[PDB]
Amino acid sequence: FVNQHLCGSHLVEALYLVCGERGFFYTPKT
Amino acid sequence: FVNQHLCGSHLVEALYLVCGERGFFYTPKT
Amino acid sequence: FVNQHLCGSHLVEALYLVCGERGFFYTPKT
Amino acid sequence: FVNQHLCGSHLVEALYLVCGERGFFYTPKT
Amino acid sequence: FVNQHLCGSHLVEALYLVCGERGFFYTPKT
Amino acid sequence: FVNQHLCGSHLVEALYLVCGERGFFYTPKT
Amino acid sequence: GIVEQCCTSICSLYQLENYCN
Amino acid sequence: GIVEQCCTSICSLYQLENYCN
Amino acid sequence: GIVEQCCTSICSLYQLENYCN
Amino acid sequence: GIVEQCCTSICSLYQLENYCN
Amino acid sequence: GIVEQCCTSICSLYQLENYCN
Amino acid sequence: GIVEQCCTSICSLYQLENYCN
Ligand SMILES: [Cl-]
Ligand SMILES: [Cl-]
Ligand SMILES: [Zn+2]
Ligand SMILES: [Zn+2]
Secondary structure, three states: OOOEOOOOHHHHHHHHHHHHHHOEEEOOOO | OOEEOOOOHHHHHHHHHHHHHHOEEEOOOO | OOOEOOOOHHHHHHHHHHHHHHOEEEOOOO | OOEEOOOOHHHHHHHHHHHHHHOEEEOOOO | OOEEOOOOHHHHHHHHHHHHHHOEEEOOOO | OOOEOOOOHHHHHHHHHHHHHHOEEEOOOO | OOHHHHHOOOEEHHHHHHHEO | OOHHHHHOOOEEHHHHHHHEO | OHHHHHHHOOEOHHHHHHHEO | OOHHHHHOOOEEHHHHHHHEO | OHHHHHHHOOEOHHHHHHHEO | OHHHHHHHOOEOHHHHHHHEO
16 A cells, blocks of 8 residues: 545545545545 | 435544534544 | 535535535636 | 537536637536 | 445445555446 | 646546546556 | 434434534 | 436446536 | 635535525 | 356455556 | 656646546 | 644545544
8 A cells, every 4th residue: 555645525535545445534624 | 405315534524514513523433 | 504615526515415315516716 | 529428527528628719508407 | 344325426436545655437328 | 618626536537528438547657 | 323313214414413522 | 316326327428528617 | 615615714614505406 | 257256256455456557 | 757747737538538448 | 623734735535533522
């Protein structure tokens, strides 16, 4: 697997692919 | 707004839209 | 709902989610 | 090019691709 | 990681994720 | 068809739409 | 849960806010 | 309309241009 | 317009709703 | 081929690496 | 190449067609 | 955090895996 430069919705798509049915949490800094 | 079917990667795109900086969790086994 | 920073195709995805079966028009400046 | 099935958010992504700056309308009830 | 169903544009998004700069081929008739 | 400014995964989505069942190769420079 | 609210059945943008942190 | 041309049935990129402004 | 605003600046789902049919 | 490995059947991220250049 | 061109600069669907199999 | 890192900088699928449930 290669390293990733992921902003915005593109990060969430990646988390989705990586985690599958496990699901994930998306937690940006405030 | 509307009600539609939101599945898989489309469902997480919609979560990112609605929640954004708040963050969210996607936990389909729940 | 949170505010949105949306460029390119990401705007169209947002319009799609927001409008549903109502549909929408995408009208950029020329 | 080709003919394929284009639905929902994929259909609007394809409209954005083809029309771009011209703009477009997505009016599924029509 | 997981195993899930990856079709169409979602399958090519996943190829782009995994391969990135290496590049990839998407050859469904194969 | 209009001209396109396409980076990252957005290029792969475009190649997907344009090529259909023919498939395509994605070959970035190294 | 979320899949059986908005995917299997349909749900609104407001219902989706149920899953924000 | 567009759904019953490219989604239900299939359509080309050229047919999609029918829906540009 | 909305297209620009959303990109140069931020916009809300409520502003986007005005572009629904 | 790829469609009948990860779409029709399911496949892992590692199996997807089979299709990198 | 195409990948770069499309991103640094603009490209057409017709140029993209050259990368189909 | 991961959200930022991934965007300002690069991140790996293995770092992303830590955010799975
Ligand atoms: Cl972007
Ligand atoms: Cl689908
Ligand atoms: Zn993007
Ligand atoms: Zn889809």
